[PDB]
Write a protein that binds this ligand. Structure first.
Ligand SMILES: O=c1ccn([C@@H]2O[C@H](COP(=O)(O)OP(=O)(O)OP(=O)(O)O)[C@@H](O)[C@H]2O)c(=O)[nH]1
Ligand SMILES: [Ca+2]
Ligand SMILES: [Ca+2]
Ligand SMILES: [Ca+2]
Length: 1118
DNA sequence: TAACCGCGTTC
DNA sequence: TCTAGAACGCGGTTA
């Protein structure tokens, strides 16, 4: 009877919408033909779709439908409602008797079923579906979703029983219609997704709402301009603690509406009335903020709710507002006897996020977290503003927030409007165009398009294709609770992913000579392939013909000579060429080349059309066999356990009474113990080479969806490279032009990276939990193939140059200055074709060794005729040459550091900075600032030995800071330089039985500040490592840096407690630091970046105060 | 030493 | 309920 609450909320939503200008529109009646070619003749209203929600409407019980919120061409707004019967399917194990099943379900579901019907869809798991055979299904249609759910509850027992054996009575006897129900299908599709897919309606498109339905207006494709608002709230706060929606109150709320700024102030906390002012951090971001100095918090809350109600915003944007701002405003409204929903139509949803019916809430922190491609260290508003808006917003220590409400209140007002300016323009410039364009292809509304996982977005895209090709959706994947290998219980299984190699460390610079040993057989190979490779570069790499290029022979000879000079002088000491080669959309193009997709992975039983491809399976299992396995379960069966309902008539249960899971949970622990004692190892790892069949004739709806999104992303990736060239062609004095060109580059880099995470997820989706198209084989084939290609390329580079670092699909390398480099074919039309010989030599070989010659495609659908052709879209791309690249080395013998380096452009700017602590979130600020100071200095110096001498100076100055026990620095730069920060993904209760600096910091923070400090995850544990107690583990000396700002009484007690020294009176931070610990941290940094890499290049220790490891001193002494 | 964990990176 | 993947560096504990 929950329909009541649902029918109720619909009427509430209907009224809130009309209050905001969204009255329900019903179009005139029309009896002429429905043809989009006569859109101007059909009666109806034209609007721009801005939102969609599922609703329960009565005619004038509840009927399911979808509310579609529009903005019209006359500056007005409205909404329209489409109704559509929810439905799912019943599949049969005997197609000749579906009418019996049909007759049974029509009576068994007499209560909730509205209609039924026999439908055929294409099933990709069925024999002969490639010849036109279809699956026969019963389409069960309902009046609303509540009825659909009841049928599923009524059908699951029949599905549970039909796989639970048949209770027999007369044992001497030799089919029921119930047993003909194989499974239910397409039952877990969200209703609004179902309507958006079947009706082909997308937010962001123009439609004409007529009686016949929605007619897309393809004549207009430019978005209408909604009313957009962004807001930031700032609240008082207990010193050294977090705000509380109960005790603390909102000081002020800054916001901007379509460009115009505002600020409401609570004058019971703000010491003075604030006067209108301007914060325009850059000319392109105007910010004229009118102020509203209200009396009390209640008055502030009512100005906000009244302004919102008057401007009527279809989009409201925040930064982390779903988990702070909106809940704070909601609790402050409740305490003050205000109801947020009745006032602004906003209320928390099933996951604690605040949404409305008429306005989309766009938390920009969701975009940053999912689509920015920004590291977690750079996901704060300040870092996002710097990177994406090109300036520094106003800063303010959060401890100073509540005091400055009284002492310096104008400064507080400037900070709040800074956060406001950043959020509005971040949304309008970045989040708004991306999400609303994405809505035009994804059947979700803006709220969900921004928030759903990228694997769900991929699933949404694939379901469209599958539906529009009449392909039956697979049910969501499910793992077995237990899987076994050679009698051992498996802990985990996966595939061998990407191949990563650390090949060389040290300093490499375009002006510092390097030693090259060139394989003369490699040069002989390149010369044998040269003629065809340049023909390949002309015709395949440039979509051209060798006839129209006029200087083909001159280029051939020029490269030939340079090659031959290298074959005679194998040993060479030349300047380097620091280049990067990487496959463009590697895993996508690997997939499309090999026709990879989950429905193409076939067994030998179920299928020339077959292309055998290899992958590596890796499993982690216990060392115990089955004989041992069953022994522990028997012992667990005799044991008794506590009941999950703490309060129950009963208070204990048996194993067999426990969930098959909790059971396996207990089996896991005991099995681990037994393996640790009898075997001494708890987990055995094994890699098994496997081979899979990929049918080259299967319905390619998946791989076509990847290919289409690949081409979608490439448009923005290409525009970014186009504008990176346009900026290089503008004269340096022509400012503004460079400024707009740089803005275009940041725009298209961002857009293409935001598509890259979706493109990335098309690869990961086949391994996602709940994936409708699961395939471990397809992913393993993709990874192994890329590893085969990247090492073939390394083999060639090894023989004509020095590869430095290798990762998955990319290689960093130095090549001789005299290696064939860049050439330009000239066409009869004067058009020039670019040629990077290092690139095209790899791509010709790639297309010799990895082409798919078995790719098939439907030529004639009516008579099912396939044609085979050769497909290969795997190409290396190239960037460089660069000024410098710095790769660190390990502290251990014969070991490298993968995934960490720094690359510098010829102009001196930083190109790439990978992996280093400087980039990661948290880490020790000392190591952060040291790395920040060091990498630039690697460009100074006239020789390699003089280069290391330049960095050594910074090093010794930083060692001087620590050898001096922080006497040099003022009090601040110390507390800031020696603090280490770490985040806790869970809360501290969830780390039971674990030792870590963050755990110790969190517990000590709670004993001194209260249990409210650990009530939420994501805590920022800021700590220093104390010297005392001596000889104690480091996790036992982590002191939270908040104590040194606490009142003396608390400081001494806890300090004394934490140092195990009750006689301590000296409380000065510098006397508490274990400076030897930090001196060792800096030493390891200097060791891995400077000293050991220098030794590997034959340079005496440039920082002798950092002693070499004993293995390195012995290696040089011999 | 070597196994192992949490966090946050590079792909 | 909703939920893309694996390989890797490093500080730190623990067989
Ligand atoms: O977050 C990520 C990044 C990368 N990958 C996977 O790593 C592969 C190689 O990682 P790349 O960064 O080279 O991606 P790409 O080739 O698709 O992009 P561009 O070089 O054209 O810029 C990608 O093709 C993808 O499958 C992920 O699965 N997730
Ligand atoms: Ca803020
Ligand atoms: Ca790539
Ligand atoms: Ca690339």
């Amino acid at each position: 009877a929950l329909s009541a609450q649902q029918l109720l909320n619909a009427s509430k939503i209907d009224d809130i919408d009309s209050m905001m200008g969204f009255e329900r529109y019903v179009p005139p009646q029309y009896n002429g033909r429905f043809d989009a070619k006569d859109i101007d003749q059909i009666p109806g209203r034209v609007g721009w779709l801005t939102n969609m929600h599922a609703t329960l409407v009565s005619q004038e019980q509840g009927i399911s439908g979808v509310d579609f919120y529009f903005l019209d061409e006359e500056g007005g707004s409205f909404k329209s409602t489409v109704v559509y019967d929810p439905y799912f399917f019943i599949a049969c194990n005997d197609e000749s008797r579906v009418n019996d099943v049909e007759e049974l379900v029509k009576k068994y579901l007499e209560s909730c079923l509205k209609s039924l019907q026999i439908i055929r869809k294409e099933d990709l798991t069925m024999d002969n579906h490639l010849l036109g055979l279809q699956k026969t299904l019963i389409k069960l249609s309902f009046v609303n979703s509540n009825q659909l759910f009841e049928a599923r509850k009524l059908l699951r027992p029949i599905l549970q029983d039909n796989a639970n054996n048949n209770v027999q009575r007369n044992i001497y006897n030799v089919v029921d219609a119930k047993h003909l129900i194989e499974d239910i299908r397409e039952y877990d599709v969200p209703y609004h997704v179902r309507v958006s897919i079947d009706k082909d309606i997308r937010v962001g498109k123009w439609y004409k709402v007529t009686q016949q339905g929605f007619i897309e207006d393809t004549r207009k494709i430019a978005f209408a301009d909604p009313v957009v608002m962004a807001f930031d709230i700032e609240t008082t706060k207990p010193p050294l603690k977090f705000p509380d929606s109960a005790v603390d109150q909102i000081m002020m709320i800054s916001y901007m509406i379509d460009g115009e700024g505002f600020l409401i102030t609570n004058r019971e906390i703000i010491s003075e009335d604030i006067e209108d002012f301007e914060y325009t951090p850059k000319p392109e971001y105007p910010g004229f903020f009118t102020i509203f100095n209200e009396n009390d918090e209640v008055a502030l809350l009512q100005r906000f709710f009244e302004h919102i109600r008057d401007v009527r915003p279809t989009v409201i944007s925040t930064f982390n507002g779903d988990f702070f701002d909106w809940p704070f405003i909601h609790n402050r409204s409740k305490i003050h006897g205000l109801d947020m929903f009745d006032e602004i139509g906003f209320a928390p949803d099933a996951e604690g996020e605040y949404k409305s019916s008429y306005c989309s809430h766009m938390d920009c922190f969701r975009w940053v977290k999912r689509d920015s491609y920004l590291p977690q260290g750079s996901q704060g508003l300040k870092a996002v503003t710097q990177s994406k808006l090109g300036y520094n917003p106003i800063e303010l220590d959060p401890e100073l927030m509540t005091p400055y409400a009284f002492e310096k209140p104008q400064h507080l007002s400037e900070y709040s409007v800074s956060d406001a300016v950043a959020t509005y323009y971040l949304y309008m410039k970045y989040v708004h165009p991306f999400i609303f364009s994405l809505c035009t292809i994804i059947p979700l509304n803006p709220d969900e398009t921004l928030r759903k996982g990228t694997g769900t977005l991929c699933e949404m895209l694939l379901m469209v294709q599958a539906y529009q090709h009449n392909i039956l959706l697979p049910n969501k994947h499910t793992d077995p609770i237990e899987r076994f290998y050679d009698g051992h219980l498996l802990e985990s299984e996966t595939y061998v992913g990407g191949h990563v190699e650390s090949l060389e460390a040290g300093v490499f610079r375009s002006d510092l000579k390097n030693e090259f040993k060139i394989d003369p057989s490699a040069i002989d190979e390149l010369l044998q392939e040269l003629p065809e490779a340049l023909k390949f570069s002309v015709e395949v790499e440039n979509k051209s013909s060798v006839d129209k290029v006029t200087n083909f022979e001159e280029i051939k000879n020029q490269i030939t000579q340079k090659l031959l000079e290298l074959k005679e002088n194998n040993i060479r000491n030349e300047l380097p060429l620091i280049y990067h080669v990487d496959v463009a959309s590697g895993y996508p193009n690997i997939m499309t080349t090999n026709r990879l997709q989950p429905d193409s992975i076939k067994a030998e039983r179920d299928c020339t059309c077959a292309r055998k491809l290899k992958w590596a399976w890796r499993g982690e299992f216990f060392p115990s066999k089955m004989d041992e396995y069953n022994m522990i379960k028997r012992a667990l069966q005799n044991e008794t356990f506590p009941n999950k309902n703490k309060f129950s008539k009963k208070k204990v249960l048996t194993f067999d009474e426990l969930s098959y899971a909790d059971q396996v949970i207990h089996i896991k622990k005991r099995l681990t113990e037994y393996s640790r004692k009898v075997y001494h190892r708890v987990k055995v790892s094994e890699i098994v080479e496997r081979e899979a069949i990929v049918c080259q004739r299967e319905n390619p709806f998946y791989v076509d969806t990847v290919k289409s999104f690949r081409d979608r992303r490439y448009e923005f990736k290409g525009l970014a490279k186009t504008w990176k060239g346009n900026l290089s062609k503008i004269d340096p004095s022509d400012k503004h032009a460079r400024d707009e060109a740089k803005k275009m580059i940041v725009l298209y880099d961002s857009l293409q990276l935001a598509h890259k995470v979706i493109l990335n997820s098309f690869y990961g989706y086949v391994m996602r939990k709940g994936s409708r198209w699961y395939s471990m084989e397809m992913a393993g084939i993709t990874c192994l193939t890329g590893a085969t290609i990247i090492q073939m390329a390394r083999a060639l580079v090894e023989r004509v140059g020095r590869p430095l670092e290798l990762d998955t699909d990319g290689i960093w390398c130095i090549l001789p200055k005299s290696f064939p480099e860049t050439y330009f074919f000239t066409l009869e039309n004067g058009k020039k074709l670019y040629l990077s010989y290092p690139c095209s030599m790899l791509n010709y070989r790639v297309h010799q060794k990895f082409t798919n010659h078995q790719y098939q495609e439907l030529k004639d659908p009516l008579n099912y005729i396939y044609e085979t052709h050769s497909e290969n879209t795997i190409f290396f791309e190239v960037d460089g040459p660069y000024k410098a690249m710095i790769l660190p080395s390990s502290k251990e013998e014969g070991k490298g550091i993968k995934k960490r380096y720094a690359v510098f452009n010829e102009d001196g700017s930083l190109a790439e900075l990978k992996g280093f602590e400087l980039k990661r979130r948290g880490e020790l600020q000392l190591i952060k600032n040291f790395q920040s100071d060091i990498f630039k200095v690697f460009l100074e110096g006239d020789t390699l030995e003089g280069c290391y001498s330049a960095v050594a100076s910074v090093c010794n100055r930083w060692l001087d800071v620590l050898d001096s026990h922080g006497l040099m620095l003022e009090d601040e730069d110390l507390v800031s330089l020696i603090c280490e920060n770490r985040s806790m993904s869970k809360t501290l209760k969830e780390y039971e039985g674990q030792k870590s600096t963050s755990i110790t910091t969190a517990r000590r923070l709670g004993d001194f500040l209260g249990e409210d400090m650990v009530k939420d995850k994501g805590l920022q544990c800021k700590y220093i490592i104390s010297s005392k107690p001596f000889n104690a583990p480091v996790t036992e000396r982590a002191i939270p840096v908040a104590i040194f700002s606490a009142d003396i009484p608390i400081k001494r007690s806890f300090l004394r407690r934490w140092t195990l020294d009750p006689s301590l009176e000296d409380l000065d931070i510098r006397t508490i630091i274990d400076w030897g610990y930090y001196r060792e941290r800096l030493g390891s940094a200097i060791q891995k970046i400077i000293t050991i890499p220098a030794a590997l290049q034959g340079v005496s220790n440039p920082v002798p105060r950092v002693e070499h490891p004993d293995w390195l001193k012995r290696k040089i002494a011999t």
